[PDB]
Design a protein around this nucleic acid. Structure first.
Lengths: 110, 299, 299, 108, 107, 100
RNA sequence: UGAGCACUUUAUCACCGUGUCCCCAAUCUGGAUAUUUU
């Protein structure tokens, strides 16, 4: 619920941050364009593809990747849910299931 | 009768073996895990092909030679598998299941039973990390030549791991017709054991054995913990303490044969101490295989 | 009379056993689950065949020898199952249900009744993961030979698992005619227990026992929790605390026999402490079986 | 009806179509062009559907969790509640997905 | 367990001490105009992010580096040092999963 | 039969009424392994706290003896709604019945 | 709480068995320029 949308929120923030690193943060140059929109989604889809590929490769390292590698490169955000930032130490599997679900939804390719 | 079985390990080095045959963008090497950790690789049947090839280069008959002409690999054969006229790949006349029947069992009285007389298992590494890349790349020719390979350019990476790994095996056979020369050749060839996992022009690895240990050659099957010694540390020395203890007071000892690494860098006083029967201490591993084959074979 | 029953486990190793006989593209090993988790494999009747074979190699009569000539396996027999002229596969004259009748009960006065005098159960692993592959492949010969196996090429994979697993058994028998030699041979042969699950030239596994524990040899059936010790951890030491406590103050103790692993790496002071009767502490498991057979058999 | 029924059916047909157009790089327009190209396209779809059909049965019960093959077949506001609906009582979702796969199975 | 919040709480005091050290007049000037906060926010971002690379470099010395840095700024360190055996006998649990991911990647 | 014997032990026996003929709950039309006792007469009595006297018609259900007992008691009445065991329950029924 | 209104669907017990298969490893490819003050 609230954690699920939190996973959703960080998914958008990480994607746009990667876009900011590679190109402009704001998205208005690609409006009604047959080429600018093409490249904007192309760089979008390749960034999430490689990030998702790295995450799903560490299948059996469920717990450790959730401590170390799956949480440094994605810039995470925390406001008050320190108490709920505890199941990451004992669940370590469903949180991954949520993350892959969120990244899969953020695949706007037809 | 005598039955022997041994364990070996190779020197540490970087390595990588084509093992995926699944995807092209990335290569995966990891196969099986242990106690919640992924530190084991390699197949238990490629070394069979390596042994076959090495036996081919040693002058024994070329009964089954791999040929590479079609897109998919195919292997030829001689007239028929025969464990008597020739070595039959160490007498490996194997199952021939077909509806034609008309097998040699009714003509040459060959039941198609394939002698095995060999035992081997998959190797296991000693280092767990398999999350590093090298990030090479492939070019596009575009040189106006008559052949274009991919008509594209890609940035694809590969994974390698620096590790040393152990290897057990068992024989538990017996001498028969034409066997002593063939088993002697097998023991000679197992010493080198090069060309594993097919051709590799970018990564070069060897199976030269160090700290080889063979157990209970004269006695029946009683060995245990074949995967014992690891972590670049000796472990069979305490096994001699606890299994067939050196002194014949509470647990009589047994005839063992030890490799070179376990005695090259180890306490000098221990050599004199480990002299209840003297065991079998050698400097280079290849030296002891000839004597072991002579003793076990009986000639 | 005395009744004995014991439990064992083997050393950890990779393993895989042909268990499907259902599909060819993929192989399945998993058999039964526990508490919502799938961590148990292996059949409770293959080791019967293994024991029969090992008894064959030990010089006892070859009453029922497996022959492999037809497509479907068939096993021959002697003139008739007789538990007196010979061991009868440890006196296993079993049911013969047929309309012919004319059994030896009216000629040799043989009621065809069994002498089981044996108890065994299926083994259970201690590791739950069975979702890994190796991805090997098979070639097409196409070498213009007289025999073509499949006339195709396939990319088929197999599943393996690295696990150690336990094994209980019970005997609860009694000495009779020609028994002491046969029961002694059975106890000698159970120590090795090699060649399980038929032939396997690619995966090599052993049933050499470590940390064997036998319970309540002189007393009647009172044991409990045969599957107790697991997770590479000793558990019968607290069982001695709670069942037949060592001190004879609130719960008098009992004659137990312990294996080697539970005493090889364990507190030195505990050996002295566990000396109300001294129990039976041994270094190698094979050593204690001879003494246990001598004590229980009475000779 | 914005319910589970069409959602799983849409993702099932989309999943199989996407990766066949990725691995084999084929479109239905080329399939109908000639009978020859159609049959191996049908054969290629035959291998694609069955491998998932057998393998999805391989992992059963709660050990399937909500993590599936190729990361749950890589499926806005409706996703939040729908994910929670499939968070608990997952037994029926997997069972009804086999119906979609059988539906995608080519006829004859 | 309880040390997770202890590491959590001490980190905000650590970064607040970080801000009070490099920057002057602290948050009292925030009400002046949102402009100066942007330089304060970007500077506070550019100091933590460079520390990310150093802190996650190598386990052995990432200990040695962070003891001396941690002893400097906070003032309630006397309470924590005398308790739980100085972070459970020096290095345990890879420095609390790398200082709880540098305080959850700085909030 | 002796084997596989079934015995009738009391388990949440609840019903009462003033000197008037039976009505209201009809002793049937109830769900299984649930709170038919509870749902039925708690809902009726909340609807009929003033219509029917809950003081004489004591509590219902053995499960409510474990949770929310205080809330139900305070919202309904302070009557002789004791419910611990059927034995002492019938004991106090007999105690109150000797006088009537 | 009224007249046709009874008394119980009652008591016991084994599926014997035995027994699993062999065969196999591919390929090629790298990059360019650029600092100053308290």
């Amino acid at each position: 619920r609230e954690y699920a949308e939190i996973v959703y929120k960080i998914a958008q923030g990480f994607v746009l941050s990667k876009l900011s690193s590679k190109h402009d943060l704001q998205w208005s140059k690609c409006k009604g364009n047959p080429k600018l929109e093409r490249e904007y989604n192309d760089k979008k889809e390749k960034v999430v593809n490689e990030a998702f590929l790295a995450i799903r490769s560490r299948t059996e390292k469920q717990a450790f990747i959730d401590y170390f590698v799956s949480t440094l490169y994605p810039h995470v955000r925390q406001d008050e849910f320190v108490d709920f930032a505890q199941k990451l130490f004992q669940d370590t599997d469903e949180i991954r299931s949520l993350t892959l679900l969120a990244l899969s939804s953020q695949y706007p390719i037809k | 009768n005598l039955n022997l079985f041994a364990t070996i390990l190779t020197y540490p080095a970087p390595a990588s073996n084509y093992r995926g045959e699944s995807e092209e963008n990335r290569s995966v090497i990891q196969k099986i895990l242990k106690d919640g950790q992924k530190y084991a690789i390699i197949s238990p049947e490629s070394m069979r092909n390596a042994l076959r090839e090495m036996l081919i280069e040693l002058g024994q008959p070329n009964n089954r030679t791999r040929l590479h002409s079609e897109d998919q690999l195919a292997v030829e054969f001689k007239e028929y598998p025969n464990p008597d006229k020739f070595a039959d790949d160490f007498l490996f006349g194997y199952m021939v299941a077909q509806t034609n029947d008309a097998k040699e069992m009714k003509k040459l009285n060959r039941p198609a039973k394939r002698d095995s007389i060999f035992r081997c298992n998959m190797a296991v590494a000693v280092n767990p990390y398999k999350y590093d890349t090298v990030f090479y790349q492939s070019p596009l020719n575009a040189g106006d030549s008559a052949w274009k390979n991919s008509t594209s350019s890609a940035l694809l990476h590969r994974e390698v791991t620096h590790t040393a790994f152990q290897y057990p095996f068992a024989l538990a056979g017996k001498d028969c017709a034409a066997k002593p020369e063939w088993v002697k050749a097998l023991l000679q060839a197992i010493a080198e054991l090069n060309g594993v996992a097919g051709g590799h022009a970018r990564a070069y690895y060897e199976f030269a054995p160090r700290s080889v240990v063979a157990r209970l050659t004269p006695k029946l099957v009683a060995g245990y913990q074949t995967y014992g010694f690891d972590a670049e540390g000796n472990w069979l020395e305490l096994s001699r303490l606890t299994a067939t203890d050196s002194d014949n007071l509470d647990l009589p000892a047994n005839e063992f044969w030890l490799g070179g690494e376990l005695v090259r860098k180890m306490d000098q006083e221990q050599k004199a101490q480990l002299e209840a029967m003297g065991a079998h201490l050698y400097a280079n591993p290849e030296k002891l295989f000839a004597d072991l084959a002579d003793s076990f074979l009986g000639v």
